[PDB]
Amino acid sequence: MLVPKRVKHRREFRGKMRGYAKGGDTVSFGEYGLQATTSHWITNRQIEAARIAMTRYMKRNGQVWIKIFPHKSYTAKAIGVRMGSGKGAPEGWVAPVKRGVVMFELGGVDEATAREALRLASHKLPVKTKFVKR
Amino acid sequence: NRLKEKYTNEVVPALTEQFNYTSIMAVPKVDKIVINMGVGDAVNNSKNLDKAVAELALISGQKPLITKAKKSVAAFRLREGMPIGAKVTLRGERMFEFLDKLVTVSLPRVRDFHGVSNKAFDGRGNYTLGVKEQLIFPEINYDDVDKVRGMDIVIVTTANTDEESRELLAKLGMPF
Amino acid sequence: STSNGRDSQAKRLGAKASDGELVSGGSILFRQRGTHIHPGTNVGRGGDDTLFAKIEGTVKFEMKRGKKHVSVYPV
Amino acid sequence: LRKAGLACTVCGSRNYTLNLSSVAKEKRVEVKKFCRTCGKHTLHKET
Amino acid sequence: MKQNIHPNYQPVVFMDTTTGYKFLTGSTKGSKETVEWEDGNTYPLIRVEISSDSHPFYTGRQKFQAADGRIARFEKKYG
Amino acid sequence: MISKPDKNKLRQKRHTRVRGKISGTTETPRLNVFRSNTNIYAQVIDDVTGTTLASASSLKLTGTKTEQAAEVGKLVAEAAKAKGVEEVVFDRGGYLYHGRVAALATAAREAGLKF
RNA sequence: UUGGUAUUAAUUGCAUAGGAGAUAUACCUGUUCCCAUGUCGAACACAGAAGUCAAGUCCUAUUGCGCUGGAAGUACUUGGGGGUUGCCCCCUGGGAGAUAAAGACGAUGCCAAGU
RNA sequence: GCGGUCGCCUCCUAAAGAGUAACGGAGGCGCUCAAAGGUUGGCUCAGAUUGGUUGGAAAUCAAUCGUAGAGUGUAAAGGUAAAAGCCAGCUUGACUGCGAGAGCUACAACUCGAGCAGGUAGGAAACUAGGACUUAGUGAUCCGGUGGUACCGCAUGGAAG
RNA sequence: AUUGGAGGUAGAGCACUGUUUGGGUGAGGGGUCCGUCUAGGAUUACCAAUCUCAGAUAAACUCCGAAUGCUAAUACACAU
């Protein structure tokens, strides 16, 4: 969805995925959060795809946030192409996940409301987050 | 000079009224002028500006030098270049060879509503000024003023006091 | 294509002795196309802008000038 | 562009080899150096 | 100073007569020339006899422009 | 508009520029190049134990017209010969070679020291 | 009270506040002399030191800021070992960064003089 | 197979000495400069803000702030203020003959180089100077030129070569 | 094995170069009307010109900075 508007290196490496959260490992500008107890390569369409559902349940609230920005120009290859002879096409944008990653900020949110579209994002994220307070 | 003496002895009261008393050797004091065409305009030939350098040798502060712009403007393609508008950068007792023009000749010649420039706030006790034409300085100006190519006039005190600078120039010659 | 079969030939950068050794007069100290360390007595900066000795002796390091240095202390 | 040598008065008719600006400047190169009897300079010339 | 100023200060044989208040030196105009008139290369009259108050913002305060302003645009008994 | 930046810091600035062309302090100590507004010092300095120093200058240990004197410190220059260091390091500092620098400089060159 | 010189290197510099000018330094006076200037006593230089602590300076005080500064614990990890492994856990030895309790408005010599 | 590539310099990939894998990433260079080189002597940038006739976002100016947030002839890297940055004078050391000592490593190569001599060139002297801030800017032998050449010169001299 | 150096890797935080979440901060650029001597004062609107505060973010970020290893000397052990 939302794209880093300027990039000095349009290809990256695949990176790594080790251990524990780096920073932003607590809830900063929300009341509620969802700890990523796992680690994957979450895709921007999947994230905002959760976020309109978060508008659907979470109808009239303000500063309810996701935390990350998708930083990674993730790149796949095609059908029948052999191994190498160049590197392929930047299909889109992804952010990394670590274990212990807080991802969500929630403001103006009730406790009973504070599990629901969140609980849909349990079905809209490929990671195992859970409910977190401050 | 003449305004050395009437300067110091006429500011000995304004010493006490304004900021510092008892700093009797070092009170606020003027510094210099700079007098420049600064027109830009060099891209046509630069030679008409090289008669503005004879306009600055004509007003005759000192040797009419010129400056090079740091970057050469794409909207003006001038390729940095030394002719841009003239430079003096005149100071001291030569200023005191220059101010009686300013207070009893120059703007009292051009008669343009006592030349109010209260906008000239340079932050710290300095004061800008400009001019469009100069029919100033008799028997020097005429027969080449078919267009005065301009000049700018910036006075500067040693003091950082803007209003005491207003009382320092406007002490003598020019109200604003 | 890639335009990336364009190649760089790496070469040896770094230290030679680095620790107080009785390094020969006029012998190589530290290869530098770019100076991290900075010279001293009995030490020349090269045409290759390395550090090269002039007189034997211990070649320990010094934090002069808030900066990294090599002279050669004799004996 | 740029290719020249350097002669002298005798020097075996040629002493140095340099090209400095044979298309930009295009006047003359005049360089005093040492001859085969170095220990004294002479003023030196161009091919 | 430069040495041997090939720029100006050149002496036109004239006078910076009264209330420009200058005489003649290696000098060319205005506020520069000298301070005396009691020997007189030429004599001090040719420019002007009235001072910086020759500026008509203050010439006996220069209220000779008055009267103007309130007869603009009507103090009259016509119509 | 402020003032002139101070000559002492600018001549220790240029002095720090020049000093690397100068040093060799042990076994050839340095006689200074100084100026006051008034009158200039005299000192020969190896590594830190810069054995002798004197005024030869306007603070109460002076020649009379030390400005363009011969004795702008030639006494202390001969005192370098009283040490036994006589063709040694002489400074320049943040200084022209032309001014009153040249008085003590060329006068020490008359006093049997070098440059 | 200085001034000069090194060394330590931003615990050392800044900012604020006060003092000191008479030892001195400094500010400065003029352009004459040498030297002056892409111009100009600006700068530099020469000559004097009128006036002067206004500024620089130097001293003192302040943690306002920068500077320095750990920890305990902890990331990471040798070697070894185990388990579902794009992995994780455990033993032992190492051990950060961040923090961070705190220091900090320098300190040490080297010369002429109100010392 | 097509395509591309086949040389050399720079950074990652390089795994905290080096070493470096792929049709891996990123760039290039296949030069200029008798002055952008040497030397001496000075200077500090870019940019921000104010204020000023032509006026612009910058022409210019002045002021204030300003560790380089510029520049460094030429991409990138490192380095860079005692400046390698910038400007003036001298200036032709971008000398000759070398070269201890080294480094790098199949070899060929390649990277330097203390110091000395012969005189030099600046610089008062000291001091510096065997290209450029360092690194692309370049290729093996032959063969034929160019000049010099105490060398040989086919019995003998010369000449040819 | 101890001492000596060197390396910036992992990690981290952001000290710079990059990207970026909020909150504050603001010309301006488009919505009344007075209104084209007459420009405008504007209304709110997107970024709010920076900067400020937290929040991050990286192979071609590093103010830092390992543990490992490499090298020098020494020690002890060996035999190369």
Dist CA B104 CA E55 (whole Å): 9
Please check whether strand I approaches the CB of A18 to within 7 Å.
yes
Quote the tokens at residue A58.
């979470």
- Whether residue B85 contacts residue B40, with contact meaning beta carbons closer than 8 Å, is answered with yes
Set of chain E residues whose Cβ sits within 8 Å of the Cβ of B103: 52
Please check whether strand G approaches the CB of B22 to within 7 Å.
yes
CB-based burial, A9-39: b 16+ in 10 Å, e otherwise: eeeeeeeeeeeebeeebebeebbbbbbbebb
Dist CA A73 CA E15 (whole Å): 82
Q: Could you check whether the bond before residue E67 is cis, i.e. omega within 30 degrees of 0?
A: yes
Q: How many beta-carbon contacts under 8 Å exist across A and C?
A: 3
CA F34 to chain centre: 5
- Whether residue C53 contacts residue C20, with contact meaning beta carbons closer than 8 Å, is answered with no
Dist CA F33 CA B115 (whole Å): 53
Burial of C55 (0-12, 13-18, 19+ CB in 10 A): middle
Please check whether strand G approaches the CB of F15 to within 7 Å.
yes
Q: Is the dihedral of CA A64, A67, A71, A72 positive or negative?
A: negative
- Whether residue D23 contacts residue D1, with contact meaning beta carbons closer than 8 Å, is answered with yes
Q: Describe the crossing of helices F74-83 and F101-110 by its angle, rounded to 10 degrees.
A: 40
Q: How many CA atoms lie within 13 A of F94 on its CB side?
A: 13
CB-based burial, B25-60: b 16+ in 10 Å, e otherwise: eebbebbbbbbbbbeebbeeebeebeebbebbbbbb
CA of C21 to C1' of G20 (A): 55
Dist CA C15 CA A60 (whole Å): 65
Q: Which residues, 6+ apart, have CB-to-CB distance to E39 below 8 Å?
A: none
Which residue type does B143 have?
Answer: D
Q: How many CA atoms lie within 13 A of E9 on its CB side?
A: 17
Q: How many beta-carbon contacts under 8 Å exist across B and E?
A: 74
Dist CA B161 CA B169 (whole Å): 12
Which residue type does C12 have?
Answer: R
Strand H contact nucleotides, protein CB < 7 Å: 3-14, 17-28, 31-35, 40-43, 45-47, 50-65, 77-80, 82-84, 92-96, 99-105, 111-115, 118-121, 124-127, 131-132, 134-135, 146-148
Dist CA B52 CA B151 (whole Å): 10
Could you tell me if B4 lies within 8 Å of chain E, comparing CB atoms? no
Dist CA B24 CA B21 (whole Å): 7
Dist CA F9 CA F14 (whole Å): 9
> Which letter does DSSP use for residue C45 in this model?
E
In this structure, chain C runs to a length of 75
- Whether residue C53 contacts residue C43, with contact meaning beta carbons closer than 8 Å, is answered with yes
Phi/psi for A96 (5° steps) reads -85, 160
Angle in degrees, CA C46, C49, C53, rounded to 5: 40
Cβ neighbour number for residue A50 with a 10 Å cutoff = 20
Phi/psi for E23 (5° steps) reads -115, -80
- Quick one: closest CA in B to E50, which residue? B104
Cβ neighbour number for residue E49 with a 10 Å cutoff = 10
C-alpha Rg value of chain B to the nearest Å: 18
Dist CA A45 CA A74 (whole Å): 13
* Residue among A26, A25, A32 nearest A115 (CA): A32
Enumerate chain F positions whose Cβ falls within 8 A of a Cβ in B.
1, 3
Dist CA B94 CA E4 (whole Å): 16
Q: Which residues, 6+ apart, have CB-to-CB distance to E23 below 8 Å?
A: E15, E16, E33, E34, E35, E36, E37, E41, E44
The secondary structure of B45-107 as a DSSP string is -STTHHHHHHHHHHHTSS--EE---SS--TTTT--S-S-SSEEEEEETTTTTTTHHHHHHTHH
- Whether residue B35 contacts residue B88, with contact meaning beta carbons closer than 8 Å, is answered with yes
Please check whether strand H approaches the CB of B70 to within 7 Å.
yes
Dist CA B18 CA B12 (whole Å): 10
Please check whether strand I approaches the CB of A52 to within 7 Å.
no
Query: For chain F, first and last CA: distance in Å?
Result: 39
* Residue among F37, F32, F20 nearest F108 (CA): F32
Set of chain F residues whose Cβ sits within 8 Å of the Cβ of B156: 1
Distances (CA, A) of F18 to A107, B111, B150, F9, F36: 65, 57, 46, 14, 19
Helix (H) or strand (E) holding B9: helix B3-17
Q: Is the dihedral of CA B134, B138, B140, B143 positive or negative?
A: positive
Distances (CA, A) of B160 to B171, B173, E34, F6: 17, 21, 32, 19
Dist CA B12 CA A20 (whole Å): 75
DSSP-based three-state secondary structure for A73: strand
- Whether residue F81 contacts residue F71, with contact meaning beta carbons closer than 8 Å, is answered with no
Task: State the nucleotide closest to F95 in CA–C1' terms.
Answer: G44
